[PDB]
Amino acid sequence: HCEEHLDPLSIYCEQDRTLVCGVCASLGSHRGHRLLPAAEAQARLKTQLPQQKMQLQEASMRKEKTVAVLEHQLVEVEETVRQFRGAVGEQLGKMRMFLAALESSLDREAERVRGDAGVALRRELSSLNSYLEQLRQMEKVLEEVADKPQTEFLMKFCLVTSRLQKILSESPPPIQLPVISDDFKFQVWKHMFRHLMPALEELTFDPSSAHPSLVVSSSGRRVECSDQKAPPAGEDTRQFDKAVAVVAQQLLSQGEHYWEVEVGDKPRWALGVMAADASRRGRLHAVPSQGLWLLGLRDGKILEAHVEAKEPRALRTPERPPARIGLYLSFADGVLAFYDASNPDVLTPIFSFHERLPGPVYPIFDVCWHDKGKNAQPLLLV
Amino acid sequence: HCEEHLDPLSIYCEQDRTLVCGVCASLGSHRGHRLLPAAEAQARLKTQLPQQKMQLQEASMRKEKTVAVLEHQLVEVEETVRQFRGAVGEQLGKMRMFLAALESSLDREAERVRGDAGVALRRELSSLNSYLEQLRQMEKVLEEVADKPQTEFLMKFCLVTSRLQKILSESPPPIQLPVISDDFKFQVWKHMFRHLMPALEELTFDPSSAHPSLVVSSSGRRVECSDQKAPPAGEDTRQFDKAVAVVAQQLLSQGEHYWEVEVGDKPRWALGVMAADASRRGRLHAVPSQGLWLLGLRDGKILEAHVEAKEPRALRTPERPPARIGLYLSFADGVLAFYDASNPDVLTPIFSFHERLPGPVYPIFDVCWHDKGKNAQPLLLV
Ligand SMILES: [Zn+2]
Ligand SMILES: [Zn+2]
């Protein structure tokens, strides 16, 4: 084991990790190193077995945990991708099925209209064929009895004249046709925008946080005003004392929601959202610092937005005041957008919000003064 | 034939158009019925046989005309309904296929991102599996060979420790893709609106209708402005001699067309259309009496629409001046609509018209004065 001394190696050296023999351990690479009796070295390196064992166990457990974490990340990426697939598929199939259903319904309606028109015009065709047959019969009777004996002619003259006069009073005078248009692109685009809104969140009013000026009925969907006094309020933060406003029964914190409100003949009103952690009683201002976001319309032509400032902002309204407004709320983007829902098939934008939200929020509605007699117009909520 | 006068009928009675006898017309049923004899009256009132024949022929011809009208109405309504069915179905299947294409493109993008993340995480997983195999091998070798004879045990202890120290050189570092949103549908809607416009009619310019003050080149596809003296013009009705304007070679009168134009750095310019059945030469204004609709930009930030009035309507201008505008022309609805084409994938409406449908129209484009030195800004055309 030595190649130099014609004798093998028999002594190990730990601090140089090298095997040697007596001659090499006498002159050269080793004389007094961490040589071994095997006894001192065995005891000294075996006493520290649990240290290395514990380090190995630490490394093994840590790397197993790392493997599990990475596998969990892989699974979570798979879940995210699959959820993305499903959500995109549903949100595009909504429009796909809407367009397909509309096309199929219109095609079936056109087929039914074609059948009805064919039936009517075939009835008219049968009537006209009968009329032509009667005319030919009368002509042949005339040409056959015009040269009969005098007695038969004098017997039949009046009769034939009366028959002609009677049969000359059964005849239909015949523009009554179905219509088509070229604005299909714009109408389909706008109606698709309309039908892409989420479901109408069925909101009902909440009287526990309302002012006793307005009155609510119709299964919590209708609210109007009266002309009678309300007893005074007490001491409670959740009761509205300054503004004549109300919030809804529902409390939304995640997802997507949308609802249309028809105001009808009421000239002055306002809508918006209010944070649940905000003040309901006491002096209140149109400040989002109090968690209130508002948008109001008065006089039928004066629209105003109360953004966070000491000044409202007006907008142009058409000569005919629209009476139905749709609100869309998204908690993900935190966007509350307004659209003109007075047209049942087309919406026109009005206003929108883009902020961060405390969460959650109540949809708040505020009526203007009762006008003392004439503001009995109802307020609906779909 | 009388039961009272023992005589048959021999006298005609005009007020009753009936043959009677004399006695009843003397003391009875025809006291004053203005009697007639029967032979002369029979022949004289019989003279109108060809009259009845001609009336019967007239009625037959009128009802035959009615039959022809009904048949033509049936066939033409059927053809109109079938053509509308086919056109609407195909032009909505167009949107269906567009939605499918967008969904497939997004699916391919998601698949590519998932594949890249999976490749990275699988490389890391394979590395960690190899590391775990090494750890298990080391642990099992130690716990199985820890009880060998002392010579081999002390020979292998150091080796194993050094192997652990060598393999203790692997520090573990311990993917990014978008998720669904609520404006995802709206963005898809906007891209659908952008890409749903009809095909870009590949129209080229006609140099026979340009003023030689500014320069036109590239086979009638490029036109820009210089600051140079202009040679005098010639004689042509379709060629602008007073104003530095140009029209297109093609002349279209039915259907739907759309095109985007980039204006770049030029601050003042104007575009529009001119009716072909109107006056063509001389200085012309945006008057539908001459079938002219215009739209201009000045000061680089002041956009204006030239509707039919004695004033260029000063539309509201955005904070960012757009440098690419798309124009859509529909002859059916007679609509000239403007859109913001600065976004290469989404267009936003600006204005529209609903007016006279003269037919056909020349697309007219007018550049302002060369300003003699500073109006060297180019004019692009996409
Ligand atoms: Zn030796
Ligand atoms: Zn008689």
Author numbering:
A (entry chain B), B (entry chain A): 85 to 258, 263 to 470
The authors write:
Tripartite motif-containing protein (TRIM)72 (mitsugumin 53; MG53) has been determined to rapidly nucleate vesicles at the site of membrane damage, but the underlying molecular mechanisms remain poorly understood. Here we present the structure of Mus musculus TRIM72, a complete model of a TRIM E3 ubiquitin ligase. TRIM72 is a member of the class IV TRIM proteins, which is the largest subtype among the 11 groups of TRIM proteins. Its domain organization includes an RBCC domain followed by a PRY motif associated with a SPRY domain identified in splA kinase and ryanodine receptors (PRYSPRY) domain.
To obtain a high-resolution model, numerous constructs were generated, purified and crystallized; however, most of them diffracted poorly. Based on the experimental SAXS profiles, the calculated models showed that the RING domain is highly dynamic and does not prefer the bent conformation.
